[model samples]
Target: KEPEQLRKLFIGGLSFETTDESLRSHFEQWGTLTDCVVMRDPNTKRSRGFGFVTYATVEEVDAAMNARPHKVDGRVVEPKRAVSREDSQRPGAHLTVKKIFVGGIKEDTEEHHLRDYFEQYGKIEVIEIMTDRGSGKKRGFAFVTFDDHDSVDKIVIQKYHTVNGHNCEVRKALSKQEMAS
Candidate 1:
């Protein structure tokens, strides 16, 4: 029996040769997977050697995380619970605050640039630029928190905005549960 709630796993230390099909096949044993993604280089299109695996149920997440070392393309892999903004903003958490999602950031984009671009909208509580744990490079997206919740709605209204020559996507940050589908 599986827990009904959906869950996601962050799998790292992948081989550059790993493919979506290969990852799906390897993780399917724990439970039915709703989705699997292998991040890749934008220009070269080579594997970034990291990806996400979404499970049909929370119990599947528990099983996979507790399982032995996973391997792909001859390399041992590691899996852990995927943490979303909602997880960070859990009740009693210091990170609890109003935030918006920003996507399509250029790899070379800096934190101050994001601040300069978004600060005009409202007072920023925090700016989080996601980076790859292995490569230590920007993940091409980030979260921006505002002191006022109204700022979230204001920024989201401008759905198409550009930052550092990239057409960044602006939207309300979705919870882990909301993003599963």
Candidate 2:
């Protein structure tokens, strides 16, 4: 069989359930692919709700985009950058991490206290307050995530000095790079 053309798309607004196999298989019906990458959370390692797909030829790229806005489990999977050159070579395209993180919280802090504490810096995306299930209490540490990298830096630098009387180390969660990319 002749190879169909392929192109790269910085797909935005992807459905949460999309995975490497699903994205690749879905596009394979259209054409050959160099790869498909769905970024995930740094700590929990869950899908980041967006991804990139590179077809073996430009035609395949167009076919996928033109054919897309595909629905998976009732969510609209919109294709954002079928034509933008930047999509072809996105800045931070190499940096797969989506947010900054903070850990080492007071075990006394509840979820709302954690959220209320960080709400001063930026919108909190997730607050994983790891707890001891046996005692059902905060483990004196938590993972806090911000909406974007900038806010990560802001919170790390600005507000981390004093949070409920504990100095926290705010840093990027060490995430394995998206291997599919």
Candidate 3:
């Protein structure tokens, strides 16, 4: 038996939170992908924020390269023919530090409180209750890191409500560098 011939691609400007399925699905809109991989750290195991792709044909890679589905993070994804396959699967490694911003939190909320609130849906790794650094008062905002991206999506699409009386707003956090001055 013979293996499928794949065209390798070097994709730059991926977000720190990109996933393998996402890359494959989005690229499929252009053409078929025989195989795919998103790179991660071998040690600390965090995303290096970039990845490579192997498409079934040069045409497929060309279409997705030119389509540019990404709009956020000030990224302009430019794909080029892969010189090698060494660095292809290293994009989202430590998504834990990706920073998901949340607001409309009840001021009295604590880490445990927020966890208790979100744990209803999935595993929550970290919940930082934002507060004024100087006054030590609640900032009416916080950050929640979920164990899985689907969990984040779940909260954004469904759990945007409080456990008791307040309302919650869940969203991905972007770096200030991504904002236009």
Candidate 4:
């Protein structure tokens, strides 16, 4: 059987100016890094602004997590334990739902427009547009659920999605507890 494994950190808030070498150098102080990668766009070769750092031992992962506000390229970064798919989706886990939250939507954007834009990804099961209770106007965010579920992954990978010139942010809809955290 394979030995128990060390964990990795999902380092977020990376400056676009940050490089892989810089990321590696910062994390190496905490422990021996088996791997460090700053994810970049394939088209423009620009930093997608996030990366992962793997530690050689669980102790190293703990140290890095407690290490106050990591700074890279002059900006403080957020470091969280990278949750593996198996960890995120244990048997009967409800957090593994298939909804995606789309934010930074233009105020004028409507549900049908969102549906039309995302329709090509896969069959959509539902689209919920968030609104203000008093004003009853769009909150500039919404959730889109896909019938196939896997489409959420596909759409999220695109990262920067533009709708009517507004660059929208797409990510997994966090569960209630996750949102609180």
TM-score against native, each model: 0.45, 0.40, 0.41, 0.47
58-120, model 1: which lDDT tens digit per residue?
767757765657877899996655556565466532222367777899688788989998888
Off by over 4 Å in 4: 1-6, 85-181
Q: What is the full ranking by lDDT, best candidate first?
A: 4, 1, 2, 3
lDDT of 3 by residue, 23-108 (tens): 67666677777777677888976767767777777557556645655442455564544543343345532232334676777677
Q: What digit string (tens of lDDT, one per residue) describes model 2 on residues 1-181?
A: 3222125656666677888888777667777777788989999988888887777775565466556557654577755333344433855433434454445666666778767777775677888777687988766766666665434433433434556666776655644222112
Decoy 2 TM-score against native = 0.40
State the TM-score for model 4: 0.47
User: 1 or 3: which has the higher lDDT?
Assistant: 1
Candidate 1 least-lDDT 10 residues: 172-181
After the best TM-score superposition of candidate 3, give how far the Cα of residue 95 lies from its true spot, in angstroms: 11
What lDDT score belongs to each candidate, Candidate 1 first?
A: 0.73, 0.61, 0.60, 0.74
> What global local distance difference test value does model 3 have?
0.60
Q: Which portions of model 1 miss their true places by more than 4 Å?
A: 1-6, 85-181
Q: Write the per-residue lDDT of candidate 4 for residues 1-181, one digit (tens) a residue.
A: 2122335777888999888899998889898888899999999999999988988786687677656668788999977556566756654332334778888895888888888889877779899888889999888988887875436644654538887668988877764123211
Best by TM-score: 4
Better of 1 and 4 by TM-score: 4
